[PDB]
Design a protein around this ligand. Structure first.
Ligand SMILES: [Zn+2]
Ligand SMILES: [Zn+2]
Ligand SMILES: [Zn+2]
Ligand SMILES: [Zn+2]
Lengths: 104, 96, 69, 93, 82, 69, 93, 105, 78, 96
DNA sequence: ATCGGATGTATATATCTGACACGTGCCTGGAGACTAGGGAGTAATCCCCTTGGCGGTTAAAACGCGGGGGACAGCGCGTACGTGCGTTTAAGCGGTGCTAGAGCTGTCTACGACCAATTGAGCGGCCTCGGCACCGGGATTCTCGA
DNA sequence: TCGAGAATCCCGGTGCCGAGGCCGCTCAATTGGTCGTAGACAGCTCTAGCACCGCTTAAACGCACGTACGCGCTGTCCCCCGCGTTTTAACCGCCAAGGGGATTACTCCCTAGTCTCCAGGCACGTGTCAGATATATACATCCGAT
């Protein structure tokens, strides 16, 4: 009795996504191939930024990810910054920059 | 004695505060302000502990971004000192 | 009761028409907002004059309104 | 009572791109909210997109169009390519 | 009752936020403007939070109400369970 | 006595605004001709209640007319 | 085929506040498209607000508290009073 | 027979609103007093905007409303402008104003 | 192409805006701004009209695309 | 002959164009622009007559609103002439 | 441009504590197998609306010239802001009590979905006439060179 | 200052097409029953929000001094606005051809709903090492006398 995720070859849960879609008041019916497609996109999107966060964390001689690394990873990518446009991250800080005219 | 020229200490403070991630306002006064503000919408409410923390965390990025825009407004007029005109112009253009 | 008599007289100056001094103020012009009685204004108009008695502003027939109280 | 979350799946994915790094407790609750927000956005777009054409079911095509409408630039070009292949494999078995 | 609590946002607290924003010199009249702006901003969020709380027949404002009120005006906040 | 007092009260009611009972009557309505005070008029306009309190036909902001005395 | 619209009701309302006045076709279309937008904006908030409290039925209370969330200033209180009066008149059948 | 709108003393259709609410994927079931509540709010807003539009039309020596009158009525009221802050009206125009600095000295 | 947006038309738009004096380098920048704005909406309109197996861009796709970008438009249906 | 001092004529077009409501861009060259922009996304397309009108009506309002905002930036720097460095500041503050 | 004194900053070494990572039982939600009916794919058609081309007017666009007003740089001065020190205030931390209110459980009843039969409200077509666009007339206000 | 040139002005005609009203015909809303689940209410548990006290000691506060910067003034020059002349192509009316949008049958297969069975993930407990704190030391950096 294999699960649907193993059949598709993913790591996110197909069945829970299907249930969430069904009991969410989106439409009268839900297709058979919709949860698989939706899960395969969420998995890629979350795996995209974890790698950047780990890269940002390795440069501070750290081995754990705290919100600052997530903020640094998100705000340093042009395509990723548009997605999280009007979003604030708790305990994130800001990106270091100074106007050129203020320097001596 | 020793004395730094006007401008270097502020420049160092800019670098120091742009690297850390903490809360710049105190905690007791902010909570006492929130309670007084909310007391005129409904009497004797109660506040969950994390509600005030979320409010304070959300209310600081707003000020930081507004100051960031005010800096550009001030520089546009060949100045290095921010004035209330810049804040008013920034809020006018943003649509507030 | 001199104060009460003075108050009543001052109020009478306000309510009663200034020029006719015998009819209540129930007449107005939009040009300046000065209020008079209804009886006076038609004779003033029939005098073929368009000068405000107070602020000399020009007025016409269409600049005539009734007021109540 | 209990409460579901995406913690175990996020950890399992993380152990595939950085086999040594861990994750803090406060940083987990940020990813767990990010995934929920993205899911809600995509589903909400697909629902009205299906409603516009007087349909009554949500198929793969509706959310494939919603992904193209939401994600900006090259990201979309990759996400679509990641989705369809999954579907076809699921059909083969 | 509580009164005169806006003065708890002192000069150094405002100046630290200004430094984090990246400014060098500050005029002497900025503080009143900043206090007014913050007082205006707080009320809009708190009113919606109290409305959400009142609808559910509760008496304590929870973090979920604050998150929902913030999201209602395009200011979504991550990291508090929302 | 009371007769002069009654006349003074009659003038007292007519001179001041009938709504707020504190200010001079200086605002008039072109539609109905009634006169009230400006202070009541702005707060009635800001309450989205554009209708005369007495004669009850509607009016707009531009129908307000300033008058003197 | 048939096409539903609010034109007749809008004209009927207009003949109540201005007995002798007309309206052009473009203004009629604009007023038609305004009601369809306000209705959807109000109805969409009540669904979310009923979903938050783990309920399945939207009733007069959800509309009551959505009006206060969307409409600003004196508009909200006037609308609330007007709705409440109609509801309390309808039930006295 | 007797329509629900007449029973509630309204001018907007209660039944059509009920059907639109039911067939719009908003919830599993809707109440019996929600359409009555919503149809009153919609009518109130419509009458409120339509009165100001008519006043603006009358001030221009016309007797039929055109989109310019709607724009003039909307943009001169603070709350109505705030409600429609991100809406563009076709063939509306703008509000006549000029900055004081540009005026001749 | 883009050269059809002549200088007098830009001057008329600026006059309706309320400006009194115009520099000489404004036109070449207004054209670039307008092209980007048009490109942002045409893509969404074409996506909407392609999802429905159609071949002509109707007036509903344009208003839907404008609405999804934060700027609605009254007077063209819906 | 007769002449007008620089400025008085420009103050009359402002009053004239703020009272009218018609479009200010010629229709044919605008249509030929959209029909060419839409050529890269998908070839052999057709346009309904009202779609082009809607697109033009949407573009005019955006351009006019941006031109209204850049004037405040021009005034802020004690100027009367608008320059390309004002449009950039307005768009930056807006969030583009 | 030169160096030297003084100050703030980055680097390598103990230690030590609480949060992260792993193991266990147990449900409750997900997988397998089966049936029935309506939503959607496919073929045919037919007529509306889109594209393409021609000829005439004339309104708008392009080009050149002259001059005056506004943009920009350089100077001078005086007040407001940054830096540092000594003194005053209240934030932060810990520990202890008390109780209001959030959360869960068990019953039961009124209310909203679903179905069948009727009939009047609202929509599509069709006239028609009057509100609005265009034309001159005689009443009070622009403007710029003396 | 005040006169000349360009722009008001109220008011009796003329013509046209689109807004307003009327009619025939469906089909969506109204009445009347029936039933089963959602939610309203009473009861009980226990947790976390509010209040008080005492002690560091970090940060807010007030004062004085000097200087860099904001602001007003003057001068130059160059570039943008007004106006007249010539070249362009937008706009309008008319015709003709055909692509594809919208509607109507027909059928089949895909998804909801039901029941049974059981493995995954959630709450709970436990160990140990990654990062925070403290400290000595080397080094970059700023300002002043030359
Ligand atoms: Zn008199
Ligand atoms: Zn006078
Ligand atoms: Zn009064
Ligand atoms: Zn009256």
């Amino acid at each position: 009795a294999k699960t649907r995720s193993s059949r598709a070859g993913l790591q996110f849960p197909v069945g829970r996504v299907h249930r969430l879609l069904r009991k969410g008041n989106y439409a009268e019916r839900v297709g058979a191939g919709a949860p698989v497609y939706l899960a395969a996109v969420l998995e890629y999107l979350t795996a995209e930024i974890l790698e950047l966060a780990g890269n940002a964390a390795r440069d501070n001689k750290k081995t754990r990810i705290i919100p600052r690394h997530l903020q640094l990873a998100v705000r340093n990518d042009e395509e990723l910054n548009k997605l999280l446009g009007r979003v604030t991250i708790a305990q994130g800080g800001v990106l270091p920059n100074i106007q050129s005219v203020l320097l001596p | 004695p020793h004395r730094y020229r006007p401008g270097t200490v502020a420049l160092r403070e800019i670098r120091r505060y742009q690297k850390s991630t903490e809360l710049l306002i105190r905690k007791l006064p902010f909570q006492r302000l929130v309670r007084e503000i909310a007391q005129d919408f409904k009497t004797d409410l109660r506040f969950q502990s994390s509600a005030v923390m979320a409010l304070q965390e959300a209310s600081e990025a707003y000020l930081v971004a507004l100051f960031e825009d005010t800096n550009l407004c001030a520089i546009h007029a060949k100045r290095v000192t921010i004035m209330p005109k810049d804040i008013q112009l920034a809020r006018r253009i943003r649509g507030e | 009761d001199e104060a009460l008599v003075e108050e009543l007289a001052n109020f009478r100056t306000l309510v009663y028409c200034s020029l006719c001094s015998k009819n209540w103020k129930n007449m107005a012009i939009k040009t300046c907002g000065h209020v008079f009685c209804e009886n006076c204004c038609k004779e003033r108009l029939a005098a073929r004059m368009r000068k405000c008695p107070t602020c000399n502003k020009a007025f016409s027939s269409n600049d005539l309104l009734t007021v109540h109280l | 009572t209990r409460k579901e979350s995406y913690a175990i799946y996020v950890y399992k994915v993380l152990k595939q791109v950085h086999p040594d790094t861990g994750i803090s407790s406060k940083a987990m609750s940020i990813m767990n909210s990010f995934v929920n927000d993205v899911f809600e956005r995509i589903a909400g777009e697909a629902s009205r997109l299906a409603h516009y054409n007087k349909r009554s079911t949500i198929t793969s095509r509706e959310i494939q169009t919603a992904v193209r409408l939401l994600l900006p630039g090259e990201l979309a070009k990759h996400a679509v390519s990641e989705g369809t292949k999954a579907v076809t494999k699921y059909t083969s078995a | 009752v509580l009164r005169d609590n806006i003065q708890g946002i002192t000069k150094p607290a405002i100046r630290r936020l200004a430094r984090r924003g990246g400014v060098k010199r500050i005029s002497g009249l900025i503080y009143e403007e900043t206090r007014g702006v913050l007082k205006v901003f707080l009320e809009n969020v708190i009113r919606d939070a109290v409305t959400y709380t009142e609808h559910a027949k509760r008496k304590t404002v929870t973090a979920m109400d604050v998150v929902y009120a913030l999201k209602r005006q395009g200011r979504t906040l991550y990291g508090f369970g929302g």
